[PDB]
Design a protein around this nucleic acid. Structure first.
Ligand code: ADP
Ligand code: ADP
Ligand code: BEF
Ligand code: BEF
Lengths: 85, 452, 98, 92, 99, 93, 84, 102, 89, 452
DNA sequence: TCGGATGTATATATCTGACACGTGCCTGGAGACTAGGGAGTAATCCCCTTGGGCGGTTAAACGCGGGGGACAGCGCGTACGTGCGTTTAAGCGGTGCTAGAGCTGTCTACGACCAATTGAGCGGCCTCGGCACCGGGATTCT
DNA sequence: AGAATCCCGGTGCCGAGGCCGCTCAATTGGTCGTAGACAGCTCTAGCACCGCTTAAACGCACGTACGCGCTGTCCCCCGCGTTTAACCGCCCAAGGGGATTACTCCCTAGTCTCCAGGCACGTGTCAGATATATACATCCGA
């Protein structure tokens, strides 16, 4: 009866955006089952990085995940990022 | 119309000294008439020139309508929309050659802001007229930056509430309407009250609702509290403490472990004090609207609305309802539509031409769509509803001047029946905190009125 | 009607997206996603607006790197189409979870 | 002349499996594992104290070194046990 | 000292190691206690699994093969010891798509 | 016996053992020749050459068992030098 | 005419050894071009490690490569070696 | 009062490098040639990357280095691509690579 | 930051090329990353030998361990030239 | 044979007191022709019980031959080889039942060591006899450990040079031949010379080459130096300074950047002083052997050998050549074979039965294979060459007693023609350093002889 | 093989908002003495890596069937690419409101330094049984 | 058939476990600067809802070309047996080399005193962006 009914935020990563990412990766054809596989392998990456970032935040006794918490979490897992301090 | 003849006497004067002015005429007094009157006064004395009018979407329509009914023949054209605006741009009239066919340019704040480039090319505009001055009350608003690119040799500002929040909105306007007395140094007003009245007598021109016409019947703004019911108290404590997302999560049909909406507890407590269904329907993420359709009676403020309305159908005089959000108006509509009442509604989600015809139908006296839902900023500015007679403000806050502009919507020249206003509220609650804040803001407003 | 043959509009897209540097996901759904993910470890959190930017730009450089080697697995298997098998092979001989 | 963790691992093993013994190669493997873990946790604690501006390594950043270095279900137990000891150390 | 804490590892030697390696300027009092508890915990969880793998092979003394098997079965330890090679430690038996 | 049956005997036999699969003396000779181009007149401890062989054999066994996932992915049973290159391409070497 | 004719040490790694390594990897059939490919990736890996293990030794003024230099050289490359 | 950099003939701040070496207490004592050596190495690497980036900018017929040019220079060269093997330069992009029909 | 010094080096190799505000941020990050890699390798080198001093031999070994071959070969010569000019001159 | 009758008088005595002895009889006489005499003295009546003989591969053959020629019928059998040794083990005779057919067990040091298990089972051995005592001069040698597992109720040791290096070899032997002399405390000898002669008179039994019978005319050991030629000097300096691997690397046909063989120089400068080709052959592959065949004359020591040999063909008496390595003997063979001389050669690489027949042919007087290459340890122990008359030691070192055992090979009962010895060497060189070291070792040896 | 639909590639401009000095101090440089010891450069005993050998004995190398697996070709049909006409929804402006990050001021507790103990651990004595380690026969196998 | 294998009696022997005399480590008690935690004040961003544009997402229809299966050929890899030569080897030998301890110096600590840098903030001057225009180049279908 009326109301709104929201949508899984992971569904907010739309099919066109995944196709754009694959095109930048060099891909020519996509199977129709790639999208639900990519949606699942993005969530794991984000869970790992965010779990480290929030630990760094709570150590500082802060309530705001900042931009080094993320850069430190990334450098710790082999992923060095330039351009954010 | 005498006042309006003193309204055209003072804008012909402003035209003379080469000055710019803030027509702060009382809201609900016919400011618009006067505007087209000044615009005919000049239209035919060699004042042909690029002429530009900017206003809110809702009013643009009313203005065209008024032109079609007061002035016999003023070449005019509504430049609304995008891409379809490109054709009428030239089927308007010559590019810059201004003749007796050069049509009055009527635009909106979005259009004006988004594509000023198009109109930037036009000649020094004889008179740019901005309907709602409150739009420019911030000195860093992007509209103001884009509004300076226009080459304007004269400016004009229409409003009914010049200051609402504080004095800095007066400061930002001045610099705009009149760069001459800008004083970008915090201003020197801060005895002094008289000194301010020396600067402001020259331009500001305000009237009043009492004026002279006994035609205007008086209105009554009265606050009728309600008693927060048990269930709302349970919801409120489970928030004052915590674990509401979980006690209610006991159900949580959707969005399991629904995000603790523990932000600005105040707000998440105002939403409760409006109707608990708001906080319920997200945690549970269910699809069906109130199951019993009567639990709506669990909301105390809802029950006081219902009884008020049954007593106001005893006479049938048409009502007006206002709200801050649109989820709550939706609940209301659901409730009444189940009983069977015919309702009309114009929020910001509805389209422009769609909402214009709804009024044209609501304005139809024969039709029995008495109820009229209407959100504040949605359509609380620029709409005549002489048909209605009573305004109910379910909830409004943070700026008292927001509410007034709505009350007048119903109460405006031509409203014969005396108007009431029912500011509902809940006693001993977060609502009273806001009410007191509003009173504080008014306190400032009345110190401003003493200034007047 | 004038149509293009299958796989010619895909090759001009590869050239288009391999010259630009822009950020290829919508910004609001990504923020809602990361807030939903972080809503487990700690509740009632705040995100400095430059941190979600760092996250988005760290997350797309990862997917672009994964796609350009799930596309080496497809060519090894005599194809031009990528299926989930290629992603799983690539992630398993990288050790991403093995 | 050469100090190791042989005694303590042997005592722990007798506490876990009262009858199993352990050879020398496995004993070396276990000694190396403990040294590796100690170095990991200590270096992370030092670096994490250096991110903030503090010259002191307390216990509450042995917490977060553990939460960064150990995975999932392993850390949630280890952390708990750590707190246990410290309480029994001070309210003694 | 480290009898008041119910540990089996040396808190004093741990503190000597921490202050020798110059990881910081000052070392608190709960730091060697915490670090010595979380080491005996990990030793106790590896040794139990190794002993279980010893019991299946009808053996009474653990060998490197048993540590290898215990580490490669469990998910958490294999994730922690993901790049370690246990000397003289064979491999986890497995065969793919054939007899 | 038929082609392919005493091979699986070998997969089973060698995955149970723990002993070294390269002969010791040729490996020692190799590691000595490929250090003559960094430092002349160099000697090795006997445990330094046992540690190099343990790491090298582990490396090669670990590379062979994902070289075998690539061959199966391409629907084969025979490993070819094309598979080693795919495996090293993605691991980063 | 009747003298010592030597061979590239690279060959001392014989075909049966490579087949034993592949069998422990799970491989069932092996092409005949594998041996010269394995024999070339092994040398690359091994001379990456010896180059660092000898640098760690030159710093200490030693002339003997110890089993600890090799462990440090292996740890520098992401692979840890327990038990020496 | 001649600075240490002029004595060493460098452009990087030998004294500021020495302070950065002290702070953080990497150890107890720091020699007198350590910061000079470290500053000389840092200047060398900087000049290497900047030269390649300037060439890449001229190749694109520009006169101002942007992140794209740093990305191009780093990922074309061999030793620099080995060193910066797993780093993400932001607002750069991957170099052109089409393989086979794909 | 090192920006001043970075700019100087640019005006030595390309006297007519400038730099964007973001590219200088990249260069700053790169210098700060390399310095910390080298200073930590030197710390380990000193601790493995039980010495309490980081001389200019720890820096040389850290450069040989950290920088790739041809790059390290030239970095070493630059640094030794600088130290010779420092002590002699 | 009188001495040999006093040799059997003293081992019948040893058998009596229940003692063990070291037959250090002079090398080049008796021994073998004395051992089988004692073994018939007991094989008569006393039988053999389980009787075991261990010896070097080369001698095992000579021993069988001698048995076949001196003793009429001694059940005997050579247990040589592996797997083929399993059949003869039983086609030997009953397992443990010792009868008049139980055959004498003759084994080698490898066989004895590798499969002692088989012989471990046999009864307390009546007499284990070890031909070359020098094999056991180390007290940690694995043969000694495996030799104790045998249940031996009597022991015997044959040798001709009891001590060569120092006194500790005397110490290790004693404990073995006679554990009554455990004395595992560095020994108490360290006036004392007489005190040592009290312990050693009871067992050790030494005779001399002069003895009584003229038989072998006195030999002459003479050192004839040679002058290092220019090219060798060039090689030596580039070795002493450096860059030899590169100056010679100027060619380096194979093994580019050949490994600097800068192993203390000692391991190389001697190789130069032997023949420079050894170095050249490795730095540059040079598949072809010095094609000029007169580049061998660049070696000074080679040229002194050649002239000596031309003057010794003037008489034709057969020569003997010894060396330390086998690459150098190979060069020599190449050189002479080009001229056409027929050569026979027995190094360690050649097989056993193969080398036994070569001797049986060399021993053939009619055949004109006069030259005989022979490496020291290769076949410098246990071989009769009464046919030859002159021994040339190209090079030998580190242990002087190694050389003597070779000289006697030619000089042994039955050698009618007087023997010379030509220890070649290079003057003012690394060789003289070794020569002096050897003299030092002999000095010790002569202090030992004074002891005698 | 032409002729056409567009697609990128060169050339006109404006237009920002960024790049480009300028300044003015304050915190970090450099300079000069003094102290302690941390290297530096010796002298000695040794355990220890470095040549020959030399056997020798499984393992390596070579060769020969012969099948079973790789690879090419061919057919079918299904799922994905291209283009077009709606529908959201992100993506912008405007409107508010504390919350929480940052710095400073103040005292109590906590950790480094140092003397005098003493019982922990480490290197080196012995001693026995749980690893192996061998034949020798019942059972699967393809 | 002719081939594969576990379990159960028979085998040693040397490495794991105990003992130990000990001496240098870690404990108790003291002293004391300076870090902690707190407390408070300031006020700068996260965020939170609503209203418009327009660009992007979404659905849909066709059509085709790429994936997948089936069949045939041939070649190369595997299993087995014989013969050669090499690693795991017994011995030989010298110089090496590697962790030891020695007075001796000079070379890093500090405590301080001021000139010097740098970083922040306040201004212009663009130059590479972007949009309109114009050719010059390429897929495509017949
Ligand atoms: N001078 C007038 N002549 C005729 N009708 C008038 C006049 N002034 C006001 N009205 C009536 O009263 C209504 C309200 O006045 P209006 O101009 O709409 O007010 P506002 O000032 O709020 O725009 C008009 O729409 C019209 O119907
Ligand atoms: N008693 C003897 N009777 C006969 N010939 C003898 C006798 N003693 C020695 N010979 C001869 O002299 C040779 C050398 O003696 P042999 O026993 O071989 O010496 P060795 O003591 O070195 O073994 C014998 O082979 C034999 O030909
Ligand atoms: F135009 Be009015 F203010 F309604
Ligand atoms: F047998 Be003898 F010593 F030649």
């Amino acid at each position: 009866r009326h109301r709104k009914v929201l949508r899984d935020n992971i569904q907010g990563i739309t099919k066109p955006a995944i196709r754009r990412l694959a095109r930048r990766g060099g891909v020519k054809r996509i199977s129709g089952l790639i999208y639900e596989e990519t949606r699942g392998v993005l969530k794991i990456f984000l869970e790992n990085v965010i779990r480290d970032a929030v630990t760094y935040t709570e150590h500082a006794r802060r309530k705001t995940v900042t931009a080094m918490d993320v850069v430190y979490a990334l450098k710790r897992q082999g992923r060095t990022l330039y351009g954010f301090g | 119309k005498s006042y309006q003849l003193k309204g055209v006497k003072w804008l012909i004067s402003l035209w003379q000294n080469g000055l710019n002015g803030i027509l702060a005429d009382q809201m609900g007094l016919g400011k618009t008439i006067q505007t087209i009157g000044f615009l005919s006064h000049l239209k035919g004395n060699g004042l042909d020139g690029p002429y530009l009018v900017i206003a809110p979407l809702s009013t643009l329509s009313n203005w065209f309508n008024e032109i079609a009914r007061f002035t016999p023949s003023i070449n005019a054209i509504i430049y609304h929309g995008d891409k379809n605006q490109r054709d009428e741009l030239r089927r308007k009239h010559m590019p810059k050659t201004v003749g007796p066919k050069f049509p009055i340019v009527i635009t909106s704040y979005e259009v004006a802001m988004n594509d000023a480039k198009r109109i930037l090319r036009h000649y020094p505009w004889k008179y740019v007229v901005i309907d709602e001055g409150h739009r420019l009350k911030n000195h860093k608003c992007k509209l103001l930056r884009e509004l300076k690119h226009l080459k304007m040799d004269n400016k004009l500002l229409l409003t009914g509430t010049p200051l609402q929040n504080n004095l800095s909105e007066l400061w930002s306007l001045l610099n705009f309407i009149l760069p001459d007395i800008f004083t970008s140094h915090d201003e020197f007003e801060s005895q002094v009250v008289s000194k301010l009245h020396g600067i402001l007598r020259p331009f500001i021109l305000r009237r009043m609702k009492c004026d002279v016409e006994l035609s205007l019947p008086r209105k009554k703004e009265i606050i009728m509290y309600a008693t927060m019911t048990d269930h709302q108290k349970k919801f409120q404590e489970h928030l004052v403490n915590n674990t509401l997302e979980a006690h209610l999560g006991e159900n949580a049909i959707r969005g399991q472990g629904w995000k603790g909406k523990l932000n600005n507890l105040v707000i998440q407590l105002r939403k409760n004090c409006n109707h608990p269904d708001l906080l319920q329907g997200q945690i549970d993420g269910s699809y069906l609207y109130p199951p019993v359709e009567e639990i709506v009676g669990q909301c105390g403020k809802f029950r006081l609305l219902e009884r008020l309305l049954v007593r106001l159908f005893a006479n049938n005089h048409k009502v007006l309802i206002f709200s801050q959000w649109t989820k709550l108006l939706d609940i209301m509509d659901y409730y009444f539509s189940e009983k069977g009442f015919e309702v009309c509604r114009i929020d910001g989600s509805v389209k422009l031409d769609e909402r214009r015809r709804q009024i044209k139908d609501f304005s139809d006296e024969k039709s029995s769509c008495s109820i009229f839902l209407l959100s504040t900023r949605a359509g609380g500015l620029g709409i005549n509803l002489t048909a209605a007679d009573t305004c109910i403000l379910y909830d409004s806050d943070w700026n008292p001047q927001m509410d007034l502009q709505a009350m007048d919507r119903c109460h405006r020249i031509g409203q014969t029946k005396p108007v009431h206003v029912y500011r509902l509220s809940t006693a001993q609650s977060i609502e009273t905190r806001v009410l007191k804040r509003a009173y504080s803001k008014l306190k400032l407003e009345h110190v401003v009125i003493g200034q007047g | 009607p004038h149509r293009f043959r299958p796989g010619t509009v895909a090759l001009r897209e590869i050239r288009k997206y391999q010259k630009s540097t822009e950020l290829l996901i919508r910004k609001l759904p990504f923020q809602r996603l990361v807030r939903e993910i972080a809503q487990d470890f700690k509740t009632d959190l705040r995100f400095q607006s430059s941190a979600v930017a760092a996250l988005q730009e760290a997350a797309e450089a990862y997917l672009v790197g994964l796609f350009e080697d799930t596309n080496l697995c497809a060519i090894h298997a005599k194809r031009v189409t990528i299926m989930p098998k290629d992603i799983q092979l690539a992630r398993r001989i990288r050790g991403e979870r093995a | 002349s050469v100090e190791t963790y042989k005694i303590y691992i042997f005592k722990v093993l007798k506490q876990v499996h009262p009858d199993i013994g352990i050879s020398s190669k496995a004993m070396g493997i276990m000694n190396s594992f403990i040294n590796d873990i100690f170095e990991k946790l200590a270096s992370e604690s030092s670096k994490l104290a250096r991110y903030n501006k503090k010259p002191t390594i307390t216990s509450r950043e042995i917490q977060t070194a553990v939460r960064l270095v150990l995975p999932g279900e392993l850390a949630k137990h280890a952390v708990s046990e750590g707190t246990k000891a410290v309480t029994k150390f001070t309210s003694s | 000292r480290s009898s008041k804490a119910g540990l089996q590892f040396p808190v004093g030697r741990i503190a000597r190691f921490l202050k020798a390696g110059k990881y910081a300027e000052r070392v608190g009092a709960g730091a060697p206690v915490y670090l010595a508890a979380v080491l005996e915990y990990l030793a106790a969880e590896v040794l139990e699994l190794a002993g279980n793998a010893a019991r299946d092979n009808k053996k009474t003394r653990i060998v490197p093969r048993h540590i290898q098997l215990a580490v490669r079965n469990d998910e958490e330890l294999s994730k922690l010891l993901g790049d370690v090679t246990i000397a003289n430690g064979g491999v986890m038996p497995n065969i793919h798509n054939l007899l």
